[PDB]
Amino acid sequence: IVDRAKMEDTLKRRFFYDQAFAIYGGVSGLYDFGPVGCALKNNIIQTWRQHFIQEEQILEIDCTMLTPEPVLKTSGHVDKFADFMVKDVKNGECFRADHLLKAHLQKLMSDKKCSVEKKSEMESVLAQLDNYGQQELADLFVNYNVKSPITGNDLSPPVSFNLMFKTFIGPGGNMPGYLRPETAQGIFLNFKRLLEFNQGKLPFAAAQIGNSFRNEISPRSGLIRVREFTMAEIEHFVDPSEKDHPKFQNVADLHLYLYSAKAQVSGQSARKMRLGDAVEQGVINNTVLGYFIGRIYLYLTKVGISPDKLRFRQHMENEMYACDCWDAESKTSYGWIEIVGCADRSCYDLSCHARATKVPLVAEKPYVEEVVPNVIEPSFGLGRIMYTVFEHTFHVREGDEQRTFFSFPAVVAPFKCSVLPLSQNQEFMPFVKELSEALTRHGVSHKVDDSSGSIGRRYARTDEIGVAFGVTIDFDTVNKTPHTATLRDRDSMRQIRAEISELPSIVQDLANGNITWADVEARYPLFE
Amino acid sequence: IVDRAKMEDTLKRRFFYDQAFAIYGGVSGLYDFGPVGCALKNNIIQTWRQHFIQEEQILEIDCTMLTPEPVLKTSGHVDKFADFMVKDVKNGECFRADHLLKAHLQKLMSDKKCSVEKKSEMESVLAQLDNYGQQELADLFVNYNVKSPITGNDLSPPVSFNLMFKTFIGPGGNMPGYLRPETAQGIFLNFKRLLEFNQGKLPFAAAQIGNSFRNEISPRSGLIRVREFTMAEIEHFVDPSEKDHPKFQNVADLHLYLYSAKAQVSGQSARKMRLGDAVEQGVINNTVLGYFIGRIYLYLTKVGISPDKLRFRQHMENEMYACDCWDAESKTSYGWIEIVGCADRSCYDLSCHARATKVPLVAEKPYVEEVVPNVIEPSFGLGRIMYTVFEHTFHVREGDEQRTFFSFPAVVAPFKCSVLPLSQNQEFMPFVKELSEALTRHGVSHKVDDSSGSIGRRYARTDEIGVAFGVTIDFDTVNKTPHTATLRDRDSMRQIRAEISELPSIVQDLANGNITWADVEARYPLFE
């Protein structure tokens, strides 16, 4: 039930992120990230790197965004990566068909003057809304006499509109291409090089962190629906016969909300289960998919998402070569939204490219068994993760002045700690320098505060952008011996007093989760 | 005089980088980077981050690549970011005019049957080759009867060909746009937000690390001329009246090769000068520009470029609102090539956008002085830096088998150290685990070697991809007490023997440059 306006205000005011090309009028679905936002984004990515690449020793590659047409023809995208779009005949404006239609069948759905059996009829229409083909959808438009929501004019018949941005590579019009809609295809195109790099053996996993593009018809859902965005995508190639993950028991004990395709057809609600139990009972298929679902859950928790607003939903038969497919979804002000994809495929694009180019993309096994690997496809939409974190960590303090703060875990906070020196009086400098150097020597990110206003108001700002900790340096620090300073916990706003030499060590342990605030108060004298 | 073929082979064989879309035929000017290359690229970027962003507390932003037309009209790019292109009339192929012409006037230039005064004439033509406008160039084509180098057919008149990739944002053809040719414009568009973020004060510097695109007519210079590429660009906004950099004396003592616009017109060679002296004598204008030139020099050295193949060349009057402008150029197998731009501007795009959009982009000063800041524009072409490093660190060992290696400084090496366990015998594991954990605890990147073949051949591979150090674990390590292992220096191939507990500390200091190999041998027993 978060106050999205209040948050969005804070987010824009402090320049986490904002409308790209604002002064030229802005462009919808495009955002610039300000220094604070970049800090956070960079943390989220580093956290991801240690959590996945480093931990599973993944093979990282970095392919181009520019993509010639034939490759994306082969992947189907040229043909099938599109949305149905009607447009206003008298005006000219464009609308996304399915949710414009859905809008109409919620006015009619919600009307006392409408019959019960008719609600039932439209309820079922929405039920299989994503199924209807071109023609069926065009009939649905006539049958419910759909009009433009802005003007109310007659609506053209729904055409398909491909979502890839089109250019030409080179001069003339010889080589047309697109901006990649996903990084998965780059990994596929390098399957051979990667497989070889892995000494020919299997399993192995490749990764990419980069931008893909998606020419959305009319984005108006803030940062959730954007035209350009950064992904972190993993492609874990496994032998179908050796499909048990050795590290699974590391995450087998995790309890988490799962929402099966069978639970959805029944009209049952989601279930919190122990990962092990789920895979043992057949809900989750195998422990490779299982392993990654657990890791994804662990990662998202780490980065600030609330476990009680996090679930894994399985694709149903209709929504698809099909696949066992789970999505991490977070409960938000925009509803439950998908923020990490996780597919399990037998037949997929690797096979297509192979016979397309006449270059074999397979693995040998000593007989010489040609193996077409399965893939698990963890797909991270960094933007949406980041937003989910904003909504989940945003809080308003009880202070009548309506102060806000983000409860960011230290591992993602724009920086872990703020040094507040009461004065710039050059007799403060040695203490600040040393503290800063110490914090650096301990790998604890920090920024020395040079803002005007009271000690209290200065922290307010710190808190507004979610800095985990603070260390005030006052005259007693500089003058009394031993030299001690105040450590302030963001969340509680509580404080402690310890020797300034000791603090770097203390803060490190707090941010690294070796020690609780509770622990600290137990060990060090309380300060107000 | 590096052997480019031998290097290129090694580079492709180990998948530092390779032809994008190879199996689809490849596309010119586009490259995928394999795991090793990504490691290196990521290091180069991190090194840059500490060296610039972190050190100067720069404001990092991250704007979009997709750019609507009007902004790039305003920056001139729509009009003036283009190359002259003739094409073969009977065939149809495209060629970059200036260097195709230049090619003709080097055959004619180098001919005994040609007169001395004629060489003189064409020498001068090449002299102001970049100047000639559309028509003049078209006359130059007739006058020297230029033909297609492939076929030899008559050549069309040189048209201008804009180098920006064109798309449309959204549906229909309402909002045409381009892929950004540089990240500088994003910073400009956010000038207000950034200036405010800096408490209204000045100076301040913004940065961006991202990709820009450049639709090259016919790239055939390997990684030097590419269509898509990553930049790190800084925009340092300074008050013209307060244009002295406080930290300049940090780099004032640096000696480095400078090559003035006046030295170039004279036909003099470059000069090695002390930075201070250069700015004191007027060669370099001010210590803000000076400071950054020094930092750039320091950075490039750090990342592996040879000081004796590094120079700073000043733009001449003709090549341009003009600007005092220096480029870092590295001497390579492709000749001296520019790898870091560094402009100093008074009048530039910020002013244009301001009056374009009717949004003031200026700084106040308390009277209320409207200040239009100057900018220093350090522009890093990461790709070319990386390549220059490949050429500068590549070496062939005296070993008759023709073994190569890269002498990469540890700070950029794909990883700093290789753990070589003689066996996978599970009695080796505790030692390897502990060593690995230790190295991790010391922030020393490393990879435990699981390759077949002799201890010597295993290091050969390590060396081939430029891993700085190695630690062999043998039976004497596992069985004899105290437990010691062999430390092997990549460059010298020399070795030492020290207690395995001590090594993490030792290696850290070696990679961090606290200690020499020399130092190590002085302190620890030598091993063969």
Swiss-Prot record, chains A, B:
Task: Give the intrachain disulfide bonds.
Answer: none
Result when mutating residue 148 to F: In CMT2D and HMND5; shows a large reduction in aminoacylation activity; demonstrates a change in the subcellular location pattern; does not associate with granules
Q: What is the effect of changing residue 436 to L?
A: Has no effect on subcellular localization; results in decreased affinity for glycine
Q: Impact of mutating residue 217 to F?
A: In CMT2D; uncertain significance; shows a large reduction in aminoacylation activity; demonstrates a change in subcellular location pattern; does not associate with granules
Q: Which residues does the record list as Phosphotyrosine (modified residue)?
A: 334
The listed outcome for residue 151 to I is:
Found in a patient with mild left ventricular posterior wall hypertrophy, exercise intolerance and lactic acidosis; uncertain significance
Activity regulation annotation text = Ap4A synthesis is inhibited by tRNA, via the disruption of the second ATP-binding site by direct blocking and/or by tRNA-induced conformational change.
Instruction: Name the catalysed reactions.
Output: tRNA(Gly) + glycine + ATP = glycyl-tRNA(Gly) + AMP + diphosphate; 2 ATP + H(+) = P(1),P(4)-bis(5'-adenosyl) tetraphosphate + diphosphate
Tissue distribution of the protein: Widely expressed, including in brain and spinal cord.
Q: Which residues carry this modification: N6-acetyllysine?
A: 87
**What results from changing residue 4 to A?**
Decrease in catalytic activity by about 10-fold
The principal localisation class reads cytoplasm
What's the further remark here? Human GlyRS uses direct ATP condensation to synthesize Ap4A, a unique amino acid-independent mechanism, in contrast to the classical amino acid-dependent mechanism for synthesis of Ap4A by a tRNA synthetase, that involves the generation of an enzyme-bound aminoacyl-AMP which is then attacked by ATP to form Ap4A.
Clinical disorder: Charcot-Marie-Tooth disease, axonal, type 2D: A dominant axonal form of Charcot-Marie-Tooth disease, a disorder of the peripheral nervous system, characterized by progressive weakness and atrophy, initially of the peroneal muscles and later of the distal muscles of the arms. Charcot-Marie-Tooth disease is classified in two main groups on the basis of electrophysiologic properties and histopathology: primary peripheral demyelinating neuropathies (designated CMT1 when they are dominantly inherited) and primary peripheral axonal neuropathies (CMT2). Neuronopathy, distal hereditary motor, autosomal dominant 5: A form of distal hereditary motor neuronopathy, a heterogeneous group of neuromuscular disorders caused by selective degeneration of motor neurons in the anterior horn of the spinal cord, without sensory deficit in the posterior horn. The overall clinical picture consists of a classical distal muscular atrophy syndrome in the legs without clinical sensory loss. The disease starts with weakness and wasting of distal muscles of the anterior tibial and peroneal compartments of the legs.
The name on file for this protein is Glycine--tRNA ligase
Gene encoding this polypeptide? GARS1
